[PDB]
Design a protein around this ligand. Sequence first.
Ligand SMILES: [Mg+2]
Ligand SMILES: [Zn+2]
Lengths: 585, 74, 248, 147, 397, 308, 234
Amino acid sequence: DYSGRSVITVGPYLRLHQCGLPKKMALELFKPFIYGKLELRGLATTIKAAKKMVEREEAVVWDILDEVIREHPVLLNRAPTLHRLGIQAFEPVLIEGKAIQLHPLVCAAYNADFDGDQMAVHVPLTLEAQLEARALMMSTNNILSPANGEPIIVPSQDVVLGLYYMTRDCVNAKGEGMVLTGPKEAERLYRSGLASLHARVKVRITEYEKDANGELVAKTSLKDTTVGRAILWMIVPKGLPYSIVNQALGKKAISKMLNTCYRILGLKPTVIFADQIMYTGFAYAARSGASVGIDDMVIPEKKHEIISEAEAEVAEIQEQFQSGLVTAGERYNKVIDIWAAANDRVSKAMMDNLQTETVINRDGQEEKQVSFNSIYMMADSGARGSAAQIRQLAGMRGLMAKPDGSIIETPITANFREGLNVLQYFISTHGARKGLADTALKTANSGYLTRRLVDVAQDLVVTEDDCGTHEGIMMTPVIEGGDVKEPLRDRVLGRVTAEDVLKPGTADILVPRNTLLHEQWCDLLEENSVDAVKVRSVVSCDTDFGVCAHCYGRDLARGHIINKGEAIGVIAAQSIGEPGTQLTM
Amino acid sequence: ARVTVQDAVEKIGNRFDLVLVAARRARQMQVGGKDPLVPEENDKTTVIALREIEEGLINNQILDVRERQEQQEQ
Amino acid sequence: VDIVLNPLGVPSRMNIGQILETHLGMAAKGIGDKINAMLKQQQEVAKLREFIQRAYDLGADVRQKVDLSTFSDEEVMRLAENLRKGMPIATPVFDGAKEAEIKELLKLGDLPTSGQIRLYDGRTGEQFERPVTVGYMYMLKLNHLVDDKMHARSTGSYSLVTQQPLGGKAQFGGQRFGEMEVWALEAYGAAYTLQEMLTVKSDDVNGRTKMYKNIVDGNHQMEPGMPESFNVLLKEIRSLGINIELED
Amino acid sequence: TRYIVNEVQDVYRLQGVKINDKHIEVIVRQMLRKATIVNAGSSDFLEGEQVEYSRVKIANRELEANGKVGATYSRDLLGITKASLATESFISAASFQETTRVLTEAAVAGKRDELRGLKENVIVGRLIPAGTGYAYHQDRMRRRAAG
Amino acid sequence: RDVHPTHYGRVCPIETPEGPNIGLINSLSVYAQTNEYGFLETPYRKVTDGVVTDEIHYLSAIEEGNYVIAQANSNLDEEGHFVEDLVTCRSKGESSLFSRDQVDYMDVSTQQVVSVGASLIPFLEHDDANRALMGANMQRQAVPTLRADKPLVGTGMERAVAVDSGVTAVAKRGGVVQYVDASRIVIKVNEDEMYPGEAGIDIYNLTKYTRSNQNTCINQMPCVSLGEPVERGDVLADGPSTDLGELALGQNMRVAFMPWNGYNFEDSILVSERVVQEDRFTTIHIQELACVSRDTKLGPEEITADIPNVGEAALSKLDESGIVYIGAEVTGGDILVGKVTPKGETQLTPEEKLLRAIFGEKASDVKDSSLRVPNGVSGTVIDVQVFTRDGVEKDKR
Amino acid sequence: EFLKPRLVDIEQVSSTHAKVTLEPLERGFGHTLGNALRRILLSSMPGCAVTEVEIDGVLHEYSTKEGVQEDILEILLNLKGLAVRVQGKDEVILTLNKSGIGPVTAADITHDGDVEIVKPQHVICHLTDENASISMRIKVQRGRGYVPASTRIHSEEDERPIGRLLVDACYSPVERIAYNVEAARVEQRTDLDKLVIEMETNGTIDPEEAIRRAATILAEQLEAFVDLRDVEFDPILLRPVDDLELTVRSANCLKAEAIHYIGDLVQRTEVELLKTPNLGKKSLTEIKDVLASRGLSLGMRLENWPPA
Amino acid sequence: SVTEFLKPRLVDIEQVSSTHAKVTLEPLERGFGHTLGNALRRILLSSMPGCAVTEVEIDGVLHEYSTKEGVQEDILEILLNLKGLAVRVQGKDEVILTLNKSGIGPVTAADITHDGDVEIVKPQHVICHLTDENASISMRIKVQRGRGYVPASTRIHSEEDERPIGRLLVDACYSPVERIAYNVEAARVEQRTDLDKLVIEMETNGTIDPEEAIRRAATILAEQLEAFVDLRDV
RNA sequence: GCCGC
Ligand SMILES: [Mg+2]
Ligand SMILES: [Zn+2]
């Protein structure tokens, strides 16, 4: 009981801890609370009178309902709850309508989008449940993902596009080498149109440093930058360098600056910074007026020449085959290889044409810069799209075939800007159907695996502080042949050392033992040349019926070491099983 | 209104014990026989207890002692 | 404009027909606009017929041949009034209009060839920096509505077996708190929320009424008991040859 | 553990998924219970039994004078499906796979559950011995130990 | 559930359900036909020498595989000869270059591989096949609005779908329109064709608002005015979501492609108030409620306007029989039909006799089992359909 | 120190199209006056719209009329587009009767005292046989914005008979507004701007009057920023306690315990009220017996207790 | 009913320090928050009278890039410091002020010569730091009144570079407004739900008080409409 | 059968 459901829309005016609740759902989810408040205020003497008054929905009932919703958190949940981020707590905001308004920053964690998704609503009618919702399950509490530690609540899509557009440069724009006293003046000139975000100008800038122990030191230095970067600097909290905003902020700088703010400043500042970032990104993305036009998909001029040359190779190799000195396998493999080479060459030509498309004059002569093409900006910012999508849109669709796994000899030489033939579309339908059928079948195989993992791991709780064991596991970077994928810092961060770490200088020890390793310690050991670190693991806890809090490092959801009473088994099962729907089988 | 309880969490650091301590204090202020030790800003007893914890004048030990003193008074 | 659509939905979906349809709709509405303007000023039938003829025989060797010469003078007026809103273009599935044809139709309608125009913010009056694509698109309303998809329950009827609330709207049911939801609550460490979901407010027959009375009294204390589903399970297992009991 | 962590991470890293190695090692630990016995002297002889019970029993036997009583053991490796059906609680592992297979053995052996895990307390309807319910379960344990 | 190369001109490789039934439910291609034995066929144009002929043959999967079939989009001359020597063809489940003489058949049309529903997507070849699947599937969920609006951009298949579906009214033997009305059309058949004796005229009863299987509204409106000549096969009245005989299942919106302050984040759509004011995307929904009276052990169940223990306010909208007046606006739990069932009682207690003495003879012994509007249902009385048993008294309504 | 715009050169293209010029303007003020004027004129202009209809035979909208080519819904949608200009009234009734053949238009609406039909060739209906008539009563009201028929309920305060044909009211006579800023021809001044406003309406509101109304609205709204400055209810309770008709001994006991109102008493529990001297076990049930006939059990909980 | 519009009441002003204010007005009709906020911001950010430093004459090198005779601060930073100096000129269209300083120490605004018709709001404003040597600095700055913001695009005065060297092309900020921003939120009154709540945040150079700036901006905007509100006046 | 994955 005390449950609801409807379609979700977006609320961009919402704070991170807020959600928009239809006022018709409330007055039903909170009926006993309304009865109690009605009887307490003397409006209704009997429960029958309160029930009749609520049934008629008078205005005083709406006033009482607002007070009931004044300070009572609520839970929203999306139907395939792969992880605990599946349900999050919010403070309801009463709205006129029939759809739940959801904050855009939690959509990624919910895996939700506004094309028909619905959520359920639950009310915690208990002092203990209300506190648990406020202290454990609120959105402002769970910002880091408890699977890798990276921020799960991050800007995306229009926020990334707006921030990327704001922090860009143009070689010649309104304002050049202009000197400004304050970033607000740059914003004032920008509002007047005197200052251009693309235009690069010098403004007086100041910074605060946490290097003094628990103290920030002011540092005022005039710096080179653009108008948009100075305008965005007004949002950054104190204690962050100015070098964090003199960049494209391509959706990776934004996550990095959020992570640095969390690690240096705390949670309340990062929660605010994120809200401000989403607001300003939306506003400037709207102001930019970005649009997609048929002319943005630029086909390279040399595409037809490459196609014709490849056709010449196909004809000559077949003639070599007709002469009889080439077997079927040889010619088939060679044709596949040359078609792949031609596809790569045409894709490279397309990307080279589309990257620095803007050849722009300067104060003297002419220069070339990064293009302001809308599709290229979408791909470069990381807001949406990739190279493979753009390559298909403006370059060849490429070699593909999935009737049984083989490859059709002649590829699709047409993009989507040009039309496809009936034959090429029929060929692509095979891969389309294969992917769509794989999606609707692998889901079970993943859910069964998640069930088995949860059922095997549910009985694991941190029940000790420190077991004192000296056992551990050696940790080294993942080097495969000549290529490395995982540095030592990633595999070591947030772990407790089983043994002392010695530098190449003998006897000398950079770090102590049984010590959790954080960003400072990892940076210190990265300056030196340590390659192997012994860290204690849960497989050697030495504690029966549970693990110690020292053999398990810090929990990834909070930078501190994990506390007793945390169900680590369910966390591990959910974090392993949440992907798998995206694993290609 | 407190969006973030960090301060309250750090006052006695477990993220689990504080939820209980605040439930005990909120029961005291809600069922009866208790008045807030901080000004009341038209907010609910839950956040009142959380703010009292953040201000440093409420913890599990004081609840145990105040209870002992009031039991000895009767 | 009537609708505002996100450009970010196009490039990662490879929905290029959206943009081409928008451009061609802009061209069609431009031709209709020209015809409407001509009809407003009551221009003589000859030049209106001439413009309709010029618009109909445009393209690159299209099969459709239509001449207004064999058209009645009144029928020309009726046709012009019928296509006063816009010219209904038709592009067959794999054999249709090309970019150049769309561009020359745009030129005949006296519109920018790129399909992008200058737009102004309605709240501030400022011009947007980049040109924004504006045109006409065919939009549908599907059979999914919030009214047919908004449900909220506080307390209703319950199944005789398991003493648990019914499911689904049109029956005033409650939302199912499944296994993964319970896993998430366990992962959070929210024991009291889980106990209040698992016991009272679900299958505790006495706990439900006690909790309702406490909430009406403004107490907010769970006082949890034992679910009836576990009693049903005990009876079902005892109905086999197996004796199952609760020790003290 | 190194073989399992490296092998499973290869699948995930190839697709671009970041998962901390702690989570994989948590599930390997649950796979490393149920040690066998290759000795005797402590009422264990050639049988599959819990690792924790062996270490607890050995420590008690080694604590006393008869240190040689402690039995040498060989650790096993079970699958996640086979390890979850080998738990000492019959209420769980009957809610996961097939009840008839588990309920039949439990009836013959006459075992007890004692409700020490998360699944068992969820079914009964009690607070979990984790999170905010961890303290409540601890206080009850002292009362049982103290009578 | 995969696409087979023999699916070419028989089943469209786009239209299919998504989740559980993918690849198991298919649709016929627009030209496909079934063999007498029961095997799917598709038409091809014969090719003799280097010139295609307008004669058309239907070939099953084996028949098509045996011959080299050219592509629909291969250029031809005035005499019918291919402009380009080397042409693209399908020989045996594959495709490659062959000489024009090598080809034995030619694809009749490009659409030959597209379903009728997909045939309605303009610029389909610039859309992803899996994505197009979604568009074709979603095209069939659209609900007709208050007024039909033609597509500004189409494909030319709207007329065939509109007419062949039987939704419109088509002149079977059209002559000249004699009388027009919102509910009837009368046509005076031309004298050039007639059935001897009794002469004859054509009467069409246009369908007015009526419930559909999905509770939408099906309505027909005339397209002809008066004294209008009408030929055979012309459209007289169009049904739901049809405009002058063309399929019109949506509306033409003026759209800008830009981000607007986070209100179109993800797939959200920002709509102006002029769309709401102009009643575009407004639909009519029709619901059916029924009440039945059956004899009971207590006795017959009677339908009456008078109801025990009910105030005059609930009986304001009832007829003398006890039914809501046609055109009444009903909300909440208003009473539609007044029905009373008898109760069982044969021991007259003195209090019961007293109750019968002060109050009516029944003393409200008869229970109340009436048809009330379910909560959440606001409707206006549109049509009442009283049916009466043979022998029992006919209802006053 | 600023020049003030003047209303000069107001030219009217068509009956609906018009141009308004504000000749003298400073550097930036062109848009500040413009965009503000466009927003005010598109949002809040008064007008008159058809509110409800009463056709003879038709009682609802989903029916048809014999002899009439269009449905009732189409007739109502046609009437929604009828533009009128009433003077001195807000609830004129536009009677319309016409029997015969051909489209029925506003023209043949009965000539009211002070009601102007801006375009009389606006068709609303069609007749298809000689022996058919249409007769309807149309109510026109004055308003400001879009008021849907479903959203208004105060009209249901008095019961409306079966046969009403209400239609959504828009009340806004402005359809399109565009503005543009040019350079003023004044050569003595260094550089001045001129604002030109094009408004397309339904012929109901004058252009100059519309501009005056918008400017007046803007001035009244700005008047607030010119000088910002600024820097126990239920009737059964709160009733005399001598309304329960209690016994004699209760009167002194209630007076002794300072029980003078009804609400304060119902806040007394049994166990604590028994502690009062000489209350009496049987007399206590008498107190409860009387308060039970009112429906007021002892032990209630009010929040604030006023002196009255 | 008609011709009657909602008026804001119980408006809240939050004054921070002495140059920062936050004004909240509620309730407003739908769309009026954006109209009022945009008009007020535009006039405040573009058309407001005030006095500012526009020309600077330093004894020594008159080039834009100069050795600065070892004054420890680049001439660009000197012009930046004089750009932010705020003055209150009384009854003068223009006035020339000269400041000369000797001996190690920071040059503040109080070191300018005293003129009875010119007021300095921040005497602790720092112009140039000491050369670090017993050197002497002579400065000649003239403050003139104007409107809005006039960037130093070009001088176009006197002949050739005679005025540009004398002016040194200092950016002129006549308007006494540092920042002006507004936000429109959702407010509800009685049964109505779609109303505007306007929040204005403004900071000032210190010559004027935020509320006074709002009053002046609204006053000039209202006086601009007199030619249309005069006859049509209540 | 359909919708959201
Ligand atoms: Mg979705
Ligand atoms: Zn350990």
